[PDB]
Write a protein that binds this DNA or RNA. Structure first.
Ligand SMILES: [Mg+2]
Ligand SMILES: [Mg+2]
Ligand SMILES: [Mg+2]
Ligand SMILES: [Mg+2]
Ligand SMILES: [Mg+2]
Ligand SMILES: [Mg+2]
Ligand SMILES: [Mg+2]
Ligand SMILES: [Mg+2]
Ligand SMILES: [Mg+2]
Ligand SMILES: [Mg+2]
Ligand SMILES: [Zn+2]
Ligand SMILES: [Zn+2]
Lengths: 91, 114, 69, 135
RNA sequence: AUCCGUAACUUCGGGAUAAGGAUUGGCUCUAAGGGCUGGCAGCCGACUUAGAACUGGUGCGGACCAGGGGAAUCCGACUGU
RNA sequence: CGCCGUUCCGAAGGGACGGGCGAUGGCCUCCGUUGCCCUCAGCCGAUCGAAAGGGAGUCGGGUUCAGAUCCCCGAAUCCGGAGUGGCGGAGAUGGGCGCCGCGAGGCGUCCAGUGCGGUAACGCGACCGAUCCCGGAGAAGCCGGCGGGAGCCCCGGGGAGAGUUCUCUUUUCUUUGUGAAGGGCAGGGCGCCCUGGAAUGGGUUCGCCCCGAGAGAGGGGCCCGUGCCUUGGAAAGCGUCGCGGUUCCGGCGGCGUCCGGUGAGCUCUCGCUGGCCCUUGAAAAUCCGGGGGAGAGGGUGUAAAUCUCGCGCCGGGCCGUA
């Protein structure tokens, strides 16, 4: 059964801290606790160890990532920027 | 019922003061002081989460008085690296060395073709 | 303490230079031959009464023997 | 096609001889009732000959060239096939699967491979087979 | 404690034990909830829940333990010091 | 007077396997010692800092007016030392050829031998090896759930003693052992192995969670076993009845120290799995494994070097303790 209408995972905070802040932290709370698919083994086991550290329980691999998401948009863009600059560097 | 007292002057419940009950031939419960729980070695691969097999799980200074058979395994790296990772290293060593020969011949060939 | 299973190795243990005495204990079900060596108290548990008497008469001479009651 | 054949050099992947080099003496791809899986009888080098240089005498060299061999039956999954093939003729009347009943035959099987390996080693043929794999 | 019931407002999490009622003893039974062995048979069982009759001068959470409640205004968000 | 400073403006090592030289010794055979030279060396910070952190190894019974894990009885263990440090075992007693004998075996040569078993996990009582290098242990938070083992409690019975018995109560109460270390076996755990190839997906927990990067199903290996048995060990202790003595005796005897059940029970502990962190929850001493192969050992033996194996030999000083 659906137990909450909108609070979702930030229902742990009860009435405290304000609706807007609770709404804001909800998006991060979901993401930092999701299990991402591992690129190295494919099993959905990638999980946050600390802030910025993501570990896979299957292949045991650890990856430096975003604070609340496996990879940040800023980093993803830079990887394509560095890939592009590499080619022109050696044509 | 009978209530127990420490047999030593350490009156605190620290990690070096743990005990267990024991009924003696005199028909009374006393405290016996347990030894700390030992740990089997971890693999040198730094990857496999499990501990090694064929090795006594004892405190580090107790390893001095154990024969060698108890502290290792009858295999290369035995007692230091898990079999699973030794398999990977034998292949990895052999397969990378083979790759070197292949590139060496191609590099030599292009030199001849050059 | 060590438990000895065979008579042969009990006799030998009694012949060690560091064996001090042999204690002969009789129970309702067995006769225990205990010899005090330097480190261990070796015991031979005998379930046959007849074998016990044969052993008691063949211990090496000079080993102090004590019967326990 | 099938390549696990006699004379094929393999690396042992498991057991007391993990990482050693052997040569297939007889291959059984289908198996038997005793060993349902596929296996091969191999004769390998427990202890490789030691590096010798021109700065050592004849005696020191002879001492350093002795090989300790072994004979085993292996599940295929514990062997790593290699492109190298080494053709030492190993007497199959002594080196066979039957040596595993009584140790007296195994001593002959191991002694046989010791002599045959040592005679080939000195000739400078199959250098790779007699160098320990550094792993 | 059990059963029922529960408003304004609300940041939809609450408010909430909101508010407001009924019940509660003893005794004698009934029903359901399991394991072991060899849709059945036998042997073992551990406390529960629910219902019914009878019963006492309506007493029964019998001592002990154990929130009064509601409508509002001011200030400070809260927890903390 | 001094302060700052703790690796920072420092020629910060007094050590060593081994090799070469001399000088001395003694179980003068040959091994030791000592002095010099060659060679090799990161640690890089003296020293202090915890009677709750790390830190090998002792338990049971008795005993005092007052001390006992310290005294006594018994049974263990750690560390260090002895090479005149002893014995055993391992290394280690194989093969080919030629005679001799019928053979069982004996001689003569030439070769081998730093152990062995399992497909594997790994196993076996040892099972060479230095500088050097890599790794492990020490060495890791808080909370939740669940499971195993104990101690205690509870329930149904046998005992022994006691209480109530006007009536009732096959009744109520008390009590009903086995240490450390060793061996064996339960039980728990495994992110250990082998066969094999799975969708009509299956397995599975309270929750989860797991699988072609190998699930189910078989068969194995390993870790902890504080649980039970066994040696300890019934000799002891206790319960009880009866006799003794100096009678202030570790006095002596008889019997007993028995069998089951049950639990989200409580306490401790072992383990599996999860959740929280813009919090990630010591270091060092100390001990161990591995990689490497510099060396060493003997020429078939009274075999040698060597051994983390089993026994044996010697010792553990100082301070606190009512
Ligand atoms: Mg301490
Ligand atoms: Mg016990
Ligand atoms: Mg071992
Ligand atoms: Mg209100
Ligand atoms: Mg306030
Ligand atoms: Mg201290
Ligand atoms: Mg399976
Ligand atoms: Mg008695
Ligand atoms: Mg080595
Ligand atoms: Mg005191
Ligand atoms: Zn992965
Ligand atoms: Zn590994």
């Amino acid at each position: 059964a659906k137990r909450t209408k909108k609070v979702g995972i930030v229902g742990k905070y009860g009435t405290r801290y304000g609706a807007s802040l609770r709404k804001m932290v909800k998006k991060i709370e979901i993401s930092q606790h999701a299990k991402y698919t591992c690129s190295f083994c494919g099993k959905t086991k990638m999980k946050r160890r600390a802030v910025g550290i993501w570990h896979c329980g299957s292949c045991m691999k650890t990856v430096a990532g975003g604070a609340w998401t496996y990879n940040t948009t800023s980093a993803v863009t830079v990887k394509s920027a560095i890939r592009r600059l590499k080619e022109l560097k050696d044509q | 019922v009978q209530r127990l007292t420490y047999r030593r002057r350490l009156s605190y419940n620290t990690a070096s003061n743990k005990t267990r009950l024991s009924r003696t031939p005199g028909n009374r419960i006393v405290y016996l002081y347990t030894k700390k729980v030992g740990k089997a070695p971890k693999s040198a691969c730094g990857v496999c989460p499990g501990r090694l097999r064929g090795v006594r799980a004892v405190r580090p200074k107790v390893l001095m008085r154990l024969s060698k058979t108890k502290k290792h395994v009858s295999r290369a790296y035995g007692g230091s690296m898990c079999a699973k990772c030794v398999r990977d290293r034998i292949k990895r060593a052999f397969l990378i060395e083979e790759q070197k020969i292949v590139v060496k011949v191609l590099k030599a060939q292009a030199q001849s073709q050059k | 303490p060590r438990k000895i299973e065979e008579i042969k190795d009990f006799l030998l243990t009694a012949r060690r230079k560091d064996a001090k005495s042999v204690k002969i204990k009789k129970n309702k079900d067995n006769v225990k031959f205990k010899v005090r060596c330097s480190r261990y108290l070796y015991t031979l548990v005998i379930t046959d009464k007849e074998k016990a008497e044969k052993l008691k008469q063949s211990l090496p001479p000079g080993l102090a023997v004590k019967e326990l009651k | 096609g099938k390549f696990m054949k006699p004379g094929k050099v393999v690396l042992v992947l498991a057991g007391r001889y993990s990482g050693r080099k052997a040569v297939i003496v007889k291959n059984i791809d289908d198996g038997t009732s005793d060993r349902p899986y596929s296996h091969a009888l191999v004769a390998g080098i427990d202890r490789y000959p030691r590096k010798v240089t021109a700065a050592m005498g004849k005696k020191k060299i002879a001492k350093r060239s002795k090989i300790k061999s072994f004979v085993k039956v292996y599940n295929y999954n514990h062997l790593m096939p290699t492109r190298y093939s080494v053709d030492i003729p190993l007497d199959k009347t002594v080196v066979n699967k039957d040596v595993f009943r009584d140790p007296a035959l195994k001593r002959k099987a191991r002694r046989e491979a010791k002599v045959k390996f040592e005679e080939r080693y000195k000739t400078g043929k199959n250098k790779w087979f007699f160098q320990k794999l550094r792993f």
